[PDB]
Design a protein around this motif. Structure first.
Motif, PDB file in Angstrom:
ATOM      1  N   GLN A   2       0.851  -1.176   0.000  1.00 22.84           N
ATOM      2  CA  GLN A   2       0.000   0.000   0.000  1.00 22.84           C
ATOM      3  C   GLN A   2       0.890   1.230   0.000  1.00 22.84           C
ATOM      4  O   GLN A   2       1.918   1.251   0.675  1.00 22.84           O
ATOM      5  CB  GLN A   2      -0.935   0.009   1.214  1.00 22.84           C
ATOM      6  CG  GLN A   2      -0.280  -0.428   2.508  1.00 22.84           C
ATOM      7  CD  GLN A   2      -1.280  -0.586   3.631  1.00 22.84           C
ATOM      8  OE1 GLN A   2      -2.442  -0.913   3.397  1.00 22.84           O
ATOM      9  NE2 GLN A   2      -0.834  -0.353   4.858  1.00 22.84           N
ATOM     10  N   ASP A   3       0.499   2.238  -0.769  1.00 26.30           N
ATOM     11  CA  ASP A   3       1.207   3.505  -0.790  1.00 26.30           C
ATOM     12  C   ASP A   3       0.655   4.403   0.314  1.00 26.30           C
ATOM     13  O   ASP A   3      -0.059   3.949   1.210  1.00 26.30           O
ATOM     14  CB  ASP A   3       1.103   4.156  -2.166  1.00 26.30           C
ATOM     15  CG  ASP A   3      -0.249   3.967  -2.796  1.00 26.30           C
ATOM     16  OD1 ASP A   3      -0.726   4.895  -3.478  1.00 26.30           O
ATOM     17  OD2 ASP A   3      -0.836   2.884  -2.620  1.00 26.30           O
ATOM     18  N   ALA A   4       1.003   5.692   0.270  1.00 23.72           N
ATOM     19  CA  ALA A   4       0.490   6.630   1.262  1.00 23.72           C
ATOM     20  C   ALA A   4      -1.009   6.837   1.098  1.00 23.72           C
ATOM     21  O   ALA A   4      -1.739   6.968   2.091  1.00 23.72           O
ATOM     22  CB  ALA A   4       1.230   7.960   1.159  1.00 23.72           C
ATOM     23  N   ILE A   5      -1.484   6.826  -0.150  1.00 25.53           N
ATOM     24  CA  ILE A   5      -2.901   7.021  -0.433  1.00 25.53           C
ATOM     25  C   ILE A   5      -3.722   5.854   0.091  1.00 25.53           C
ATOM     26  O   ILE A   5      -4.739   6.049   0.767  1.00 25.53           O
ATOM     27  CB  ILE A   5      -3.110   7.218  -1.942  1.00 25.53           C
ATOM     28  CG1 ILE A   5      -2.183   8.310  -2.460  1.00 25.53           C
ATOM     29  CG2 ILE A   5      -4.549   7.558  -2.237  1.00 25.53           C
ATOM     30  CD1 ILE A   5      -2.146   8.394  -3.949  1.00 25.53           C
ATOM     31  N   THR A   6      -3.285   4.627  -0.197  1.00 19.84           N
ATOM     32  CA  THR A   6      -4.015   3.451   0.254  1.00 19.84           C
ATOM     33  C   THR A   6      -3.964   3.289   1.766  1.00 19.84           C
ATOM     34  O   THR A   6      -4.931   2.812   2.360  1.00 19.84           O
ATOM     35  CB  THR A   6      -3.473   2.203  -0.434  1.00 19.84           C
ATOM     36  OG1 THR A   6      -2.923   2.563  -1.705  1.00 19.84           O
ATOM     37  CG2 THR A   6      -4.570   1.188  -0.634  1.00 19.84           C
ATOM     38  N   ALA A  29       0.311  16.487   1.032  1.00 22.36           N
ATOM     39  CA  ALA A  29       1.751  16.341   1.211  1.00 22.36           C
ATOM     40  C   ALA A  29       2.333  15.330   0.229  1.00 22.36           C
ATOM     41  O   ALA A  29       3.383  15.572  -0.386  1.00 22.36           O
ATOM     42  CB  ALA A  29       2.060  15.939   2.650  1.00 22.36           C
ATOM     43  N   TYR A  30       1.636  14.205   0.041  1.00 22.91           N
ATOM     44  CA  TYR A  30       2.100  13.212  -0.926  1.00 22.91           C
ATOM     45  C   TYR A  30       2.002  13.725  -2.360  1.00 22.91           C
ATOM     46  O   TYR A  30       2.893  13.471  -3.179  1.00 22.91           O
ATOM     47  CB  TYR A  30       1.316  11.914  -0.778  1.00 22.91           C
ATOM     48  CG  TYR A  30       1.781  10.854  -1.741  1.00 22.91           C
ATOM     49  CD1 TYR A  30       3.100  10.427  -1.738  1.00 22.91           C
ATOM     50  CD2 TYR A  30       0.910  10.291  -2.659  1.00 22.91           C
ATOM     51  CE1 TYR A  30       3.537   9.464  -2.620  1.00 22.91           C
ATOM     52  CE2 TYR A  30       1.338   9.328  -3.544  1.00 22.91           C
ATOM     53  CZ  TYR A  30       2.650   8.919  -3.519  1.00 22.91           C
ATOM     54  OH  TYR A  30       3.077   7.959  -4.399  1.00 22.91           O
ATOM     55  N   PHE A  31       0.942  14.472  -2.675  1.00 25.60           N
ATOM     56  CA  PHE A  31       0.785  15.000  -4.025  1.00 25.60           C
ATOM     57  C   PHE A  31       1.711  16.181  -4.284  1.00 25.60           C
ATOM     58  O   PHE A  31       1.856  16.605  -5.431  1.00 25.60           O
ATOM     59  CB  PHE A  31      -0.669  15.409  -4.264  1.00 25.60           C
ATOM     60  CG  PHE A  31      -1.619  14.251  -4.379  1.00 25.60           C
ATOM     61  CD1 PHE A  31      -1.175  13.014  -4.800  1.00 25.60           C
ATOM     62  CD2 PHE A  31      -2.958  14.404  -4.061  1.00 25.60           C
ATOM     63  CE1 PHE A  31      -2.047  11.946  -4.902  1.00 25.60           C
ATOM     64  CE2 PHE A  31      -3.833  13.340  -4.162  1.00 25.60           C
ATOM     65  CZ  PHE A  31      -3.377  12.113  -4.583  1.00 25.60           C
ATOM     66  N   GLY A  99       5.943   5.863  -1.165  1.00 22.35           N
ATOM     67  CA  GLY A  99       5.909   6.664   0.037  1.00 22.35           C
ATOM     68  C   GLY A  99       5.494   5.899   1.268  1.00 22.35           C
ATOM     69  O   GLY A  99       5.052   6.506   2.243  1.00 22.35           O
ATOM     70  N   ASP A 100       5.619   4.574   1.248  1.00 22.72           N
ATOM     71  CA  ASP A 100       5.261   3.726   2.366  1.00 22.72           C
ATOM     72  C   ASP A 100       6.106   2.462   2.322  1.00 22.72           C
ATOM     73  O   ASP A 100       6.227   1.832   1.263  1.00 22.72           O
ATOM     74  CB  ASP A 100       3.773   3.363   2.336  1.00 22.72           C
ATOM     75  CG  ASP A 100       3.246   2.944   3.692  1.00 22.72           C
ATOM     76  OD1 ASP A 100       3.525   1.802   4.109  1.00 22.72           O
ATOM     77  OD2 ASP A 100       2.554   3.754   4.343  1.00 22.72           O
ATOM     78  N   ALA A 145      15.909  14.162  -1.902  1.00 23.61           N
ATOM     79  CA  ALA A 145      15.593  12.878  -2.520  1.00 23.61           C
ATOM     80  C   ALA A 145      16.495  11.777  -1.988  1.00 23.61           C
ATOM     81  O   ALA A 145      16.053  10.634  -1.825  1.00 23.61           O
ATOM     82  CB  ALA A 145      15.715  12.975  -4.037  1.00 23.61           C
ATOM     83  N   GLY A 146      17.748  12.114  -1.683  1.00 26.12           N
ATOM     84  CA  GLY A 146      18.618  11.176  -1.005  1.00 26.12           C
ATOM     85  C   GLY A 146      18.154  10.845   0.397  1.00 26.12           C
ATOM     86  O   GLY A 146      18.312   9.712   0.846  1.00 26.12           O
ATOM     87  N   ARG A 147      17.542  11.809   1.088  1.00 26.22           N
ATOM     88  CA  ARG A 147      17.010  11.546   2.422  1.00 26.22           C
ATOM     89  C   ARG A 147      15.785  10.646   2.368  1.00 26.22           C
ATOM     90  O   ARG A 147      15.639   9.727   3.186  1.00 26.22           O
ATOM     91  CB  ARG A 147      16.665  12.860   3.114  1.00 26.22           C
ATOM     92  CG  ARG A 147      17.674  13.316   4.138  1.00 26.22           C
ATOM     93  CD  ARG A 147      17.197  14.585   4.810  1.00 26.22           C
ATOM     94  NE  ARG A 147      16.828  15.604   3.834  1.00 26.22           N
ATOM     95  CZ  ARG A 147      16.131  16.698   4.125  1.00 26.22           C
ATOM     96  NH1 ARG A 147      15.724  16.914   5.369  1.00 26.22           N
ATOM     97  NH2 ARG A 147      15.841  17.575   3.175  1.00 26.22           N
ATOM     98  N   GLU A 148      14.891  10.898   1.411  1.00 23.38           N
ATOM     99  CA  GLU A 148      13.695  10.077   1.292  1.00 23.38           C
ATOM    100  C   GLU A 148      13.996   8.731   0.638  1.00 23.38           C
ATOM    101  O   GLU A 148      13.147   7.837   0.645  1.00 23.38           O
ATOM    102  CB  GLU A 148      12.618  10.859   0.545  1.00 23.38           C
ATOM    103  CG  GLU A 148      12.811  10.929  -0.948  1.00 23.38           C
ATOM    104  CD  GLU A 148      11.504  11.086  -1.688  1.00 23.38           C
ATOM    105  OE1 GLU A 148      11.465  10.762  -2.889  1.00 23.38           O
ATOM    106  OE2 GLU A 148      10.515  11.527  -1.065  1.00 23.38           O
TER     107      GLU A 148
END
Ligand SMILES: CCC1=C(C)/C(=C/C2=NC(=C\c3[nH]c(/C=C4\NC(=O)[C@H](C)[C@H]4CC)c(C)c3CCC(=O)O)/C(CCC(=O)O)=C2C)NC1=O
Ligand SMILES: CCC1=C(C)/C(=C/C2=NC(=C\c3[nH]c(/C=C4\NC(=O)[C@H](C)[C@H]4CC)c(C)c3CCC(=O)O)/C(CCC(=O)O)=C2C)NC1=O
Ligand SMILES: CCC1=C(C)/C(=C/C2=NC(=C\c3[nH]c(/C=C4\NC(=O)[C@H](C)[C@H]4CC)c(C)c3CCC(=O)O)/C(CCC(=O)O)=C2C)NC1=O
Ligand SMILES: CCC1=C(C)/C(=C/C2=NC(=C\c3[nH]c(/C=C4\NC(=O)[C@H](C)[C@H]4CC)c(C)c3CCC(=O)O)/C(CCC(=O)O)=C2C)NC1=O
Ligand SMILES: CCC1=C(C)/C(=C/C2=NC(=C\c3[nH]c(/C=C4\NC(=O)[C@H](C)[C@H]4CC)c(C)c3CCC(=O)O)/C(CCC(=O)O)=C2C)NC1=O
Ligand SMILES: CCC1=C(C)/C(=C/C2=NC(=C\c3[nH]c(/C=C4\NC(=O)[C@H](C)[C@H]4CC)c(C)c3CCC(=O)O)/C(CCC(=O)O)=C2C)NC1=O
Ligand SMILES: CCC1=C(C)/C(=C/C2=NC(=C\c3[nH]c(/C=C4\NC(=O)[C@H](C)[C@H]4CC)c(C)c3CCC(=O)O)/C(CCC(=O)O)=C2C)NC1=O
Lengths: 161, 50, 98, 30, 65, 160, 161, 160, 161, 160, 160, 161, 161
Positions: A2-6, A29-31, A99-100, A145-148
């Motif tokens: 599941q992603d952040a949305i799900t 935030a995700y979008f 994102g999850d 992007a390296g942090r995430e």
């Protein structure tokens, strides 16, 4: 998986409630971060083999594990090590896009500790290899992007340890 | 694909851990390092020629 | 049955907590519940038999296996009976209960 | 006292000693 | 070796837990090896120790307990 | 050996071997079995003798391994253990031969001149053979330790 | 699964060293014993069913285990017992030919104790059956071939117990 | 080896070893002496094999030692000769074992994935084993060169 | 928990038979080996900590498992590892004295695999540690006492694997 | 047995076997030959022991064979002699093992509950083992009779 | 002792002494004469045991007598030989008693805490008892040396 | 068990009065001395074993009590003596931190005289040992921190005598 | 709890001296009497219940104490009396085997007078019962073994009175 949305939808559904303002803010935030996630995923898909071989050149090369007696000794073991590192980078890219980190403990970290403990694979050396892979890709795609990417790399190293 | 009888393609880590890490089936690199086995240097120096 | 423990309890010179301590160090208990188990299972059975509950944390199992590891069934029962827990729940007169 | 044989020597349901009396009472031609 | 001790240990936890009552002020023979943790525990609960007396020791021996 | 020494000592005197020398050779011939047992004891465990004796020597005399000493460095310590191996081999030869003419006639005549030309303290070499004697007589029975310690005693005596 | 040659090569390879004189001496020992191993394997392949049935006739027949209540009672259990003993003799022949018992703990002794403990199979009675099989085949092939068979038979009995 | 392969091939088929496989094992057992002679020939002269084969390789393929290639520099050329030493060692193992399962089961399975992850041209490695084969079969008698060239042939074939 | 004597008596009792000549011969074998068992047990009780620390110095030291990320990393984990190895040596001494490995699967090998799999303990590294402990104690007590120690050490390694 | 008891008693105490326990195991190991001789004496003459002990028991306690007793009738007397045979077998096991843990751990724990559920007087069973002890110690030498009478003594003591 | 241990082990179990424990006490009672002979051997030659063992210890471990060690100086070396005398006395007590409960119950329980509070290396104390064992078992016959070396073995085992 | 604050509150509560100026002045005195109490407690926690072993080296060593016949003779008695002295130093540190000796007569001096009189422990020799411990720690932490340690050390010696 | 050997060792240790000739003579006396002690202990273990019931049949039966009002009246009191007499005979056997009455005042005579005085147990009647038990066992084991039993029986009667 599941992603952040799900996951937001699953929380609001297990509540049985409608999507209130906090869920709207999480999805906003995700979008906002999604375009950066897309561009970092393209940049990581560009240089898969380079990031993997630079991670081995930083950590595992010229140490004892590539010498006789090491678990990375033979060509079969070297090819399987490159395969395992390509798996870690690919699934870290997937968890960055979603994102999850649910895909990581669903499909990487599920039986990985017991597999590596049954085979005799050193977990500390592969944790250092994943850390060098994280360092190389954070040098590649930039600071945030390296942090995430590194949050999911640290998730893989924490579940492996 | 209609030519071959099946065969055991995959083990679980439980079954592989059962069969391989038994002591007679074991190798000696599998889990920790092994150091190199040279002869002693004073024996090597005490021979009759380089 | 161990009989002098029954005598010394019915007289009242030895308290019931010392009775539980001396009976769990007694070799009937060691034959029955310490010999057919590993120390990680004999430890939890001793938790049930002496304190009346299971170990409720991982640090408790760490601590009491360290005690088992130093000093056998003797030091395990010694450390279980002499807690603050056995003294608060049961005191000196009552039998332990689940 | 004198009828008592050891319980190992007593034949059981898998042993052929029960049918041995029939095997010696039956006639076999040469 | 054994100590014939006499002590009185109030609980100070029966009001919260609402348990039934054990009679305090006991007189018991403690073994010598765990008399330590027992005296320390009576001091942990805050109870006063009235009388400590060595019962079976014959004090000053080196073997034979 | 014993037979060489008896033959030479009767040979200068222009006489045959006296009967006392002959029962000397006979007693050495009978004791050769115990000599060969001591030799197998010394031969089979040479690794532990050389290792433990080098350890106790460098514990006892640390200045020769400190910078400034002779046996400082990897190859110098290896040559030091090699010299100790040479002396244990000569000890085995002297144990078999029943006399110290192998030990003296191979590795004890010009030992002071050689170790003075190399820059070596000879007292530290005597301590090396002392630790070898300690490990070797700690490895055997009583009379076997005495018979081997006689030749170890001769080597340390011929040092100083 | 490795014979004496493959184990010697694996030791010299895990060292990373070439084949020194001790490995040459081990391989010379195997290459001297190999003809005796071949002839004993042919003689054992001659009399498989005879060795198995003589082992049952020595140990398991006319005891309680073939009577009612025994684990060798029914015809299904008798056929499975003959099958198990044929397995033990066949794999002891394989381990005799290889000169290394790696096939025994790889392919016989792997889950055999847990299988026999789950089924209710007596381990002592089958250990006595394997010992009688060893005694019969050592009477068959001679002294030294019987000894080099009995070392792997004792390996099977030790791993079973 | 041969015995492992015969045992496994009879093992899947749930049968014993067929007599043809048994005389195969017997013929390999008899030819083991010549195999050990080829192994001593390959082992004792490894320095000249690796040196001359590296020389002929860098003569033949100079771009991998030119700046821009993989084996450019001192330590990179040393690692290149080390990889050639690894392959000559596996050649010796395959010569002794009578089959290529040591060579394949150690250093030929993921050789393309490894040398692609290192950035190495695999054709130049095949040329390195070709020059090793030239120097090695220039070092032996005829049938010995054929029997060693079979395993050298397998390594170059498993490269491409 | 039963020695060779109690297992022989249990077999003769489950038969219901008296002690025949084979049981007498088994007990004579145990009563001949018992003095060697006693002397080896005294020699092993002499050097418990030395055998354990030499086993760690052979296998587990200077590898990845004592480095960060390894399961032997912290001082708590090091102390628990020394405790586990002392347990293996102590129970192998007990099984050597009894002449029967029933105490090993009764009191060591009972829930050990599931405990080690729940904790994340590597089973191959501890099997190599027990093998080095076996090698050290077989160097200590000699050939045949080392062999009769190594049969129970191999029993522990087989039940652990 | 002795080894089981020593191992367990050192096992609860978290220590190794003390040297006194070790010479206990050593003395039992040396006395095992005399134990096996007593076991063959008890095993080979079990028919006469059971027969004569049953005869002397029913002479001594005739009410259990009279109508109204437990062992009245053919099959009941056969079961009575079978129970005596069981106890002589456990006596032989305890003689070999050097301790009474076979006898106690097989046929003495719930003996009162079993013989109360069967309706059996346990004193008459103690008299049966007493007559078995009389016939058995009438069959041996002095120290052999004492060593067997120790285990017979334990059985009659564990009855009452 | 043996009698104390048997009495206590039967005492917790609420039973009498089993006959196997009784012949254990009987065998110890018969072997008491050889125990007293070993005790006179250890008692009469205590001067040479302590002297030679201290000499071999300070030869083996010279750092504890070097400045910086614990036993440096006259009175410190005298206290070191006194501690060795204490341990030889406890060895004699354990030889007579037939078990190690005198040795453990006097001088082995808090030995690590005491020697840590004094600042003493306990391995060097184990080496002191090792040299005492070497001198003592060099002083007796074979079985006497084994029976004394059991208790010396227990002391060195209880050190580490 | 009560510090200076809890004893001041208990006095004002048993009065039933509010905290007047004398109680405020007492609490100001404790809140001025508390930092010195903290630093002395850290310095004493630094050197527990050194202060204990220097106290034994001053008083109890080389006297009759460590000789045969003394109550500090055996290793068990030596270890218990070091344990008792560590208890005295630890509880003197606690009473220094609280600023009230209520913990000393609650938890040290409660049954200590009767315990020592039942065991045969010399009270004068242990009083001299506590006095030497006081002298060593007053040499360690200075004049005034040594004095406020020595008041509770003198409390322990007075309750013991 | 100490036998003659442990008491001799404790005297020589509290002296701090080695075992001189008087201690050697005491241990020689014990090692001469030990076989007689062993045989008397076996003979007493033979006839525990018979000696106890003959002691009650001599002293306590048909007197007032088994009648109503006596302390041996009920079946509970009779069973507890038989239990107490079995305790006295068992511990007298232990003190005979040790050759030292330290177990008697450690584990029988410790709180026995106060227990019997709190329960209302007559001490004179139980002293007469122990004396009759002594008379019966001295008739059983002979003159000198009966005397060395009767010294500990007289010890129990003296500590009880
Ligand atoms: C091992 C050392 C030891 C001893 C000896 C011992 C004795 C002891 N005897 C007791 C009772 C008893 N003891 C007796 C014995 C007697 N009264 C008589 O009239 C006779 C003269 C005499 C017997 C010869 C009786 C009748 C009782 C029961 C008292 C009652 O139930 O009220 C009790 C009361 C608790 C209970 O029965 O189980 C104890 C503790 N306890 C011990 O730990
Ligand atoms: C069999 C009779 C025999 C002896 C004894 C012998 C000794 C010998 N010792 C040498 C060196 C050496 N030997 C030593 C040994 C020592 N230095 C120390 O500090 C230690 C005290 C001691 C050994 C424990 C050292 C350090 C060297 C090297 C000297 C140098 O490099 O200058 C050399 C020169 C290099 C060589 O060719 O080995 C010889 C010939 N040769 C013989 O044939
Ligand atoms: C090649 C390595 C290998 C072995 C050895 C093996 C054994 C094996 N033996 C089995 C059964 C059996 N094994 C036995 C054998 C015995 N029971 C006795 O009483 C005798 C003592 C003993 C024979 C000497 C019996 C009777 C069964 C059948 C159990 C049943 O049907 O309930 C089973 C149960 C499934 C089935 O019968 O087909 C397996 C998997 N499997 C393997 O893969
Ligand atoms: C036994 C089976 C086996 C093989 C083959 C093996 C190869 C191997 N070759 C390596 C490097 C290498 N190998 C080469 C070799 C070559 N480059 C060239 O241009 C030449 C064509 C060729 C040799 C003639 C080079 C240049 C490197 C260094 C790569 C780098 O530094 O990036 C490394 C990484 C560093 C190390 O740990 O050695 C491994 C593991 N390891 C094995 O266990
Ligand atoms: C007597 C039979 C018996 C055994 C054997 C036993 C083992 C056992 N070992 C444990 C832990 C452990 N065991 C190890 C041992 C190892 N990990 C490694 O990396 C090495 C390969 C290996 C040592 C050679 C470690 C490191 C832990 C601690 C795990 C942790 O604290 O997270 C635990 C966890 C609880 C605790 O530490 O006290 C148990 C119960 N318990 C028993 O009752
Ligand atoms: C019977 C049981 C028993 C033992 C063991 C014992 C030991 C003991 N050893 C002491 C000192 C000592 N013991 C040693 C001994 C040694 N240091 C070394 O370097 C050597 C390795 C080793 C002896 C070979 C030394 C140096 C001291 C003095 C410590 C000091 O002065 O600080 C002291 C303090 C002074 C005294 O009163 O004697 C005691 C009590 N006491 C006992 O009652
Ligand atoms: C926390 C408050 C507290 C204290 C202080 C305390 C003391 C205490 N000290 C004891 C023993 C002891 N205490 C000493 C101490 C001494 N004897 C000497 O000769 C020296 C003068 C002196 C030391 C300076 C010794 C030697 C023993 C052991 C007595 C024995 O084992 O017989 C015992 C006997 C039980 C056991 O050792 O573990 C207790 C309960 N218990 C407590 O709960």
């Amino acid at each position: 998986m599941q992603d952040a949305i799900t996951s937001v939808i699953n929380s609001a559904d297990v509540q049985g409630k409608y999507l209130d303002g906090s869920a709207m803010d999480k999805l906003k935030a995700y979008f906002t971060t999604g375009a950066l996630r897309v561009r970092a995923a393209s940049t990581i898909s560009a240089n898969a083999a380079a990031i993997v071989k630079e991670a081995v050149a930083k950590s595992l090369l010229y140490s004892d594990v590539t010498r006789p007696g090491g678990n990375m000794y033979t060509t079969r073991r070297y090819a399987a090590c490159i395969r395992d590192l390509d798996y870690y980078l690919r699934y870290a890219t997937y968890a960055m896009l979603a994102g999850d980190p649910s895909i990581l403990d669903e499909r990487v970290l599920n039986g990985l500790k017991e597999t590596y403990n049954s085979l005799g694979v050193p977990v500390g050396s592969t944790v250092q290899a994943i850390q060098a892979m994280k360092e190389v890709t954070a040098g590649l795609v930039g600071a945030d992007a390296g942090r995430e990417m590194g949050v999911y790399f640290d998730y893989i190293c924490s579940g492996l340890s | 694909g209609e030519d071959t009888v099946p065969y055991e393609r995959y083990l679980t880590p439980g079954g592989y851990s059962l069969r391989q890490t038994r002591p007679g089936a074991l190798r000696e690199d599998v889990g920790v390092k092994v150091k190199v086995e040279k002869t002693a240097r004073f024996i090597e120096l005490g021979t009759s020629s380089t | 049955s161990i009989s002098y423990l029954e005598s010394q309890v019915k007289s009242g010179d030895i308290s019931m907590k010392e009775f539980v301590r001396r009976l769990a160090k007694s070799p009937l208990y060691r034959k029955q519940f310490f010999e057919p188990f590993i120390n990680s299972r004999a430890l939890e059975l001793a938790f049930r038999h002496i304190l009346g509950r299971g170990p409720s944390s991982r640090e408790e199992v760490q601590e009491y296996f360290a005690i088992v590891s130093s000093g056998g069934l003797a030091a395990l029962v010694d450390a279980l009976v002499d807690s603050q827990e056995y003294a608060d729940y049961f005191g000196e007169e009552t039998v332990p209960y689940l | 006292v004198r009828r008592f044989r050891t319980p190992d020597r007593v034949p059981q349901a898998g042993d052929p000693a029960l049918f041995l009396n029939m095997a010696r009472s039956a006639q076999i031609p040469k | 070796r054994m100590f014939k001790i006499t002590a009185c240990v109030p609980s100070q936890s029966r009001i919260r837990t609402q348990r039934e009552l054990q009679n305090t002020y006991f007189t018991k023979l403690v073994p010598y090896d765990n008399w330590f943790r027992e005296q320390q525990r009576i001091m942990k609960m805050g109870g006063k120790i009235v009388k400590v007396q060595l019962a079976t020791g014959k004090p000053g021996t080196n073997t034979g307990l | 050996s014993i037979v060489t020494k008896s033959i030479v000592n009767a040979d200068a005197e222009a006489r045959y071997l006296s009967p006392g020398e002959l029962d000397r050779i006979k007693a050495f011939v009978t004791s050769g079995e115990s000599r060969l047992r001591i030799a197998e004891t010394l031969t089979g465990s040479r690794e532990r003798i050389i290792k433990s004796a080098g350890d106790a020597l460098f514990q006892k005399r640390p200045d020769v391994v400190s910078p400034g000493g002779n046996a400082y460095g990897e190859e110098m310590t290896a040559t030091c253990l090699r010299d100790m191996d040479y002396y244990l081999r000569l000890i085995t030869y002297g144990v078999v031969a029943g006399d110290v003419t192998p030990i003296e006639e191979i590795g004890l005549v010009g030992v002071r001149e050689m170790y003075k030309s190399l820059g070596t303290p000879v007292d530290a070499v005597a301590q090396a053979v002392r630790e070898m004697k300690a490990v070797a007589t700690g490895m055997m029975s009583g009379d076997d330790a005495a018979e081997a310690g006689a030749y170890f005693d001769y080597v340390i005596g011929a040092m100083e």
